[PDB]
Amino acid sequence: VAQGPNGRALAESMNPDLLSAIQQHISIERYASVTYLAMSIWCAERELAGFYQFFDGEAKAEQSHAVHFTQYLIARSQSNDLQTLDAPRQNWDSLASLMATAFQMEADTTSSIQSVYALAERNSDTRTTVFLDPLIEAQIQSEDQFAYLLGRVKFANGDPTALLVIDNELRAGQTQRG
Amino acid sequence: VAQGPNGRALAESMNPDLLSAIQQHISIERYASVTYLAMSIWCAERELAGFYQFFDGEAKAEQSHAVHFTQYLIARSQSNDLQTLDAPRQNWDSLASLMATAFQMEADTTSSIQSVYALAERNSDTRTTVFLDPLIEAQIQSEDQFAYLLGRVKFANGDPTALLVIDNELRAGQTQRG
Amino acid sequence: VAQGPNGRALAESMNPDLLSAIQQHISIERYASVTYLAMSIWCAERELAGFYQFFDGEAKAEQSHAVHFTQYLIARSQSNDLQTLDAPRQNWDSLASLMATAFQMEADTTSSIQSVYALAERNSDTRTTVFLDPLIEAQIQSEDQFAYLLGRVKFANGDPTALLVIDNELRAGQTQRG
Amino acid sequence: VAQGPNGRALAESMNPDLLSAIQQHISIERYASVTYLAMSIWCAERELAGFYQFFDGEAKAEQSHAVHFTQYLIARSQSNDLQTLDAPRQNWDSLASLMATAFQMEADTTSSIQSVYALAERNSDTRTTVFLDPLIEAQIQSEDQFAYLLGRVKFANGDPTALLVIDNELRAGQTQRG
Numbered sequence: 001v002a003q004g005p006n007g008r009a010l011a012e013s014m015n016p017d018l019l020s021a022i023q024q025h026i027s028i029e030r031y032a033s034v035t036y037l038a039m040s041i042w043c044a045e046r047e048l049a050g051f052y053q054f055f056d057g058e059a060k061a062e063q064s065h066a067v068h069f070t071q072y073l074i075a076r077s078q079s080n081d082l083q084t085l086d087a088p089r090q091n092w093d094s095l096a097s098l099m100a101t102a103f104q105m106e107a108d109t110t111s112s113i114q115s116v117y118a119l120a121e122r123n124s125d126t127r128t129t130v131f132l133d134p135l136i137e138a139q140i141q142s143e144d145q146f147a148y149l150l151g152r153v154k155f156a157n158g159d160p161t162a163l164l165v166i167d168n169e170l171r172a173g174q175t176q177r178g
Numbered sequence: 179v180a181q182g183p184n185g186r187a188l189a190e191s192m193n194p195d196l197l198s199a200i201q202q203h204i205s206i207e208r209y210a211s212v213t214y215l216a217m218s219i220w221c222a223e224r225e226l227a228g229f230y231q232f233f234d235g236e237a238k239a240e241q242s243h244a245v246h247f248t249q250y251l252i253a254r255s256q257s258n259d260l261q262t263l264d265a266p267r268q269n270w271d272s273l274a275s276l277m278a279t280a281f282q283m284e285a286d287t288t289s290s291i292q293s294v295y296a297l298a299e300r301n302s303d304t305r306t307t308v309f310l311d312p313l314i315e316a317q318i319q320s321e322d323q324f325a326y327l328l329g330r331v332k333f334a335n336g337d338p339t340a341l342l343v344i345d346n347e348l349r350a351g352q353t354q355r356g
Numbered sequence: 357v358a359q360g361p362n363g364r365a366l367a368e369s370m371n372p373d374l375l376s377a378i379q380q381h382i383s384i385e386r387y388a389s390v391t392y393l394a395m396s397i398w399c400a401e402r403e404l405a406g407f408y409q410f411f412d413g414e415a416k417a418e419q420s421h422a423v424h425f426t427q428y429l430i431a432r433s434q435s436n437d438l439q440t441l442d443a444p445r446q447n448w449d450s451l452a453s454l455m456a457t458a459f460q461m462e463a464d465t466t467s468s469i470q471s472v473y474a475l476a477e478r479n480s481d482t483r484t485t486v487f488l489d490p491l492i493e494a495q496i497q498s499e500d501q502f503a504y505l506l507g508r509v510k511f512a513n514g515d516p517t518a519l520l521v522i523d524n525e526l527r528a529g530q531t532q533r534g
Numbered sequence: 535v536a537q538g539p540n541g542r543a544l545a546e547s548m549n550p551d552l553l554s555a556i557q558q559h560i561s562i563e564r565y566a567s568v569t570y571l572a573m574s575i576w577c578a579e580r581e582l583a584g585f586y587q588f589f590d591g592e593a594k595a596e597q598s599h600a601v602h603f604t605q606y607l608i609a610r611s612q613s614n615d616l617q618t619l620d621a622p623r624q625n626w627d628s629l630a631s632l633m634a635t636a637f638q639m640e641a642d643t644t645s646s647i648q649s650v651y652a653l654a655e656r657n658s659d660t661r662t663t664v665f666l667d668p669l670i671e672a673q674i675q676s677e678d679q680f681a682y683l684l685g686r687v688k689f690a691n692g693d694p695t696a697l698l699v700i701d702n703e704l705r706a707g708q709t710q711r712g
């Protein structure tokens with residue numbers, strides 16, 4: 001039995017380019033987390049309490065995704081390398097602009113997973129594609145959700161009254177098309 | 179005991195013009211179904227989640243009506259003839275315009291039933307008028323409901339804020355005058 | 357943030373050939389639905405009440421699959437295009453012949469999904485392959501089930517007594533090997 | 535306030551031809567009852583216990599229908615005239631032949647109601663057509679049921695094994711397509 005790079009028994013070696021890609025993706029998840037924390041704060045500063053609660057929960061979710069990836073590297077007997085984390089964006093001129101950045105962040109998180117996925121397929125790493133499959137499925141739902149929130153905010157067309165109604169929807173947990 | 183056109187024992191023969199009219203009406207119910215599916219999609223594309231859920235349920239209801247009619251033909255020992263189904267309308271410039279088409283569809287579904295009803299009376303087919311009576315009663319309630327939804331949307335006068343409020347009413351199941 | 361063809365925020369563009377393939381597959385699901393409705397009617401006309409109830413439920417299931425696909429296109433910000441629906445086959449000389457057509461319909465539904473799947477892989481659309489994966493899994497179970505029902509009916513070898521026994525199995529919900 | 539023919543206060547006079555038709559129809563219901571009693575006995579004599587129980591219940595149901603009509607005449611302040619009741623048919627060469635007579639009896643019961651209905655319409659007696667409407671609706675279901683039982687017995691094609699299976703269905707209360 002061979003020992004993997006993190007010292008555990010090694011079921012199958014991993015290509016170092018794929019390992020690097022996964023470690024980089026963990027940073028993307030962590031960056032999504034702190035971005036949604038920053039967005040939660042921006043909403044709280046403007047008394048948009050429902051948006052604040054929504055993004056507070058999304059920040060915790062993205063962090064859980066990052067940890068989920070660290071556990072996969074442990075399971076593959078690969079080293080983790082937790083990286084320096086950039087400061088998030090923190091300023092937006094409107095809720096519509098913030099929601100566009102949020103949608104972009106969600107789509108970019110998926111693109112990162114897709115990049116890892118393609119590298120795994122190039123290396124015939126079926127453990128990794130199987131690991132990522134349900135995460136891509138979750139991303140489809142999150143992209144649908146963030147498209148819904150962005151589209152509903154854009155529909156409001158900057159009217160504070162409509163934004164208050166949507167804010168109350170989010171406080172109630174009405175965050176998807178259903 | 180005589181055998182009817184579908185091969186079952188025949189309680190009473192049916193005029194072929196009435197049979198044709200019922201088969202055509204089943205197509206109307208099926209077309210109402212796919213129309214409401216198309217409307218559900220149009221609303222979902224615009225984040226009108228309550229309208230989407232409402233029309234999704236109406237599509238399933240209209241399909242159940244179609245099946246209910248197929249069961250009546252079975253009960254009368256008459257042949258069913260499931261027909262080619264036209265594509266629905268799929269594009270509207272506004273929710274008010276979509277709701278006008280929906281009301282029209284509901285009224286036209288009733289007109290079709292009325293046409294079958296008159297033909298049954300001309301043929302003294304009291305089984306068929308009795309079968310249709312509760313369906314007309316249901317249509318009165320559906321016309322009242324669709325007049326309510328259309329009128330409430332028109333009252334909004336294209337204001338997104340008001341349309342969001344109504345959308346949330348529909349998500350909550352508040353779809354009638356009560 | 358770019359807007360997709362249906363107007364929603366676009367997470368990732370979709371190849372138009374893949375979009376066309378998905379829209380066509382939705383028609384296949386809808387056609388499976390109306391085919392099973394026709395089969396339910398054929399069984400009801402011959403007092404095969406258990407087969408009638410089984411196919412009535414399968415018709416509703418296939419319709420739900422079609423809607424599930426329309427929701428995926430909404431989620432991908434792609435246009436839906438609900439198509440004209442052919443009339444189903446409606447005449448069979450025996451239950452064994454009907455069950456052969458049903459098995460074929462189920463296998464052909466899978467082949468359609470496989471065709472979409474291959475096109476998605478050619479376009480590196482991992483959202484779509486992930487979306488389809490559980491549907492293929494469900495198809496394996498449905499093919500196994502329909503092979504079971506067809507094989508059990510063929511075993512009966514046209515004996516009405518055996519077909520009545522199987523009919524009662526289906527009425528009871530005993531529709532699979534277990 | 536005028537007194538009707540049975541001595542009660544009279545809400546609206548009834549045409550004597552319509553009264554005679556209703557009194558005659560009550561005899562039809564009573565004759566259906568004793569016919570199903572005779573059929574129950576024929577089945578019991580051949581150990582067809584499920585058919586015996588089914589027809590025993592149908593005999594009681596038809597009697598309840600007769601009483602329901604006597605109550606309507608009381609409500610209309612009209613005289614009842616309970617008539618001599620013919621002996622039922624009591625001999626059949628096969629269960630299939632008995633079931634054909636049963637279906638005929640059910641259809642003939644509906645034809646009698648239809649005859650009363652047409653006479654009421656000729657006399658603009660809307661109380662009577664309203665009274666009969668739900669009874670015709672029930673007749674549609676009973677005709678569908680008796681077509682189902684007859685068709686299932688004919689499918690058995692005289693095989694005792696199949697007839698025993700159907701007999702057990704009826705004992706269990708499985709008497710309709712569902």
Ligand SMILES: [Cl-]
Pocket residue numbers: 094095096097153157158
């Ligand atoms: Cl805004």
Ligand SMILES: [Cl-]
Pocket residue numbers: 272273274275331335336
């Ligand atoms: Cl509008």
Ligand SMILES: [Cl-]
Pocket residue numbers: 450451452453509513514
């Ligand atoms: Cl067969």
Ligand SMILES: [Cl-]
Pocket residue numbers: 628629630631687691692
């Ligand atoms: Cl027989």
Ligand SMILES: [Fe+3]
Pocket residue numbers: 029032061062065066109
């Ligand atoms: Fe994530």
Ligand SMILES: [Fe+3]
Pocket residue numbers: 032062105106109142
């Ligand atoms: Fe995310």
Ligand SMILES: [Fe+3]
Pocket residue numbers: 207210239240243244287
């Ligand atoms: Fe309808």
Ligand SMILES: [Fe+3]
Pocket residue numbers: 210240283284287320
């Ligand atoms: Fe309708």
Ligand SMILES: [Fe+3]
Pocket residue numbers: 311312667668
């Ligand atoms: Fe009525």
Ligand SMILES: [Fe+3]
Pocket residue numbers: 385388417418421422465
């Ligand atoms: Fe399907």
Ligand SMILES: [Fe+3]
Pocket residue numbers: 388418461462465498
């Ligand atoms: Fe299927």
Ligand SMILES: [Fe+3]
Pocket residue numbers: 563566595596599600643
């Ligand atoms: Fe009766």
Ligand SMILES: [Fe+3]
Pocket residue numbers: 566596639640643676
């Ligand atoms: Fe009866």
